[PDB]
């Protein structure tokens, strides 16, 4: 955990995919473009996706109370736009299934004036809040790592050793 630093992602709406891309390259060695990751999500949505996916994209909530909703058919075009942000709980789950990895997300949130760094572990079956009992494995080559400091931008969390 100590040897990880916050890297840099591109400054457009592809930062989720760009963060995933950089961490995947260091951890698994596979080089994939952000655009290919978006195509991976388009292909998932086109190929008879499961009910969890249809339900997620019509029920997106956030801390501001903005409800977002779209159909699967519209998602297949939308997910290819750079303007369409990637979510760890939807696109992250899809890419975890595709690349057989787990996705570690750090989220900086504040509750009752207490800053917290929240740890989440996503895989092909969903997302779990992680910490002392569900531990993040920082030596696992098949875990990728990203951080969201709460300023509407994802960055990769990289290993300074490599």
């Amino acid at each position: 955990p100590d040897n990880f630093y916050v890297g840099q992602a591109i400054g457009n709406g592809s930062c989720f995919f760009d963060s995933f891309r950089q961490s995947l390259e260091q951890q698994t060695g596979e080089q994939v473009t952000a655009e290919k990751l978006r195509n991976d999500c388009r292909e998932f949505a086109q190929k008879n996706p499961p009910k969890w996916f249809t339900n997620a994209i019509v029920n997106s909530h956030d801390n501001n109370g903005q409800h977002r909703s779209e159909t699967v058919d519209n998602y297949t075009a939308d997910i290819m736009r750079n303007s369409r942000w990637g979510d760890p709980d939807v696109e992250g789950r899809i890419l975890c299934e595709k690349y057989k990895v787990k996705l570690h997300v750090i989220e900086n949130q504040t509750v009752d004036n207490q800053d917290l760094s929240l740890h989440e572990l996503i895989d092909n079956s969903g997302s779990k809040s992680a910490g002392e009992y569900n531990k993040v494995d920082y030596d696992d080559s098949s875990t990728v790592h990203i951080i969201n400091k709460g300023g509407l931008h994802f960055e990769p969390l990289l290993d300074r050793n490599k």
Binding site: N63, S129, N134
Partner: protein, 76 residues
Amino acid sequence: MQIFVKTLTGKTITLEVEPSDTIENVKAKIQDKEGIPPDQQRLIFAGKQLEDGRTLSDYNIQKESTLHLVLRLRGX
């Protein structure tokens, strides 16, 4: 027993839970009431994130406790 869940938007949700309920069960109960998919949810109590696979009793959460619900961060 009855517990409360407070969002960052200021909404208070009441839930009927048991001490043996897992954190997963509590998030599913929030999905049932609010439509929020569990994977978008995080629950905070006494300054700590509650881990899936543990129970309310594991965290000494008793009747009339208020948990804090914060949601997945978007970005980008």
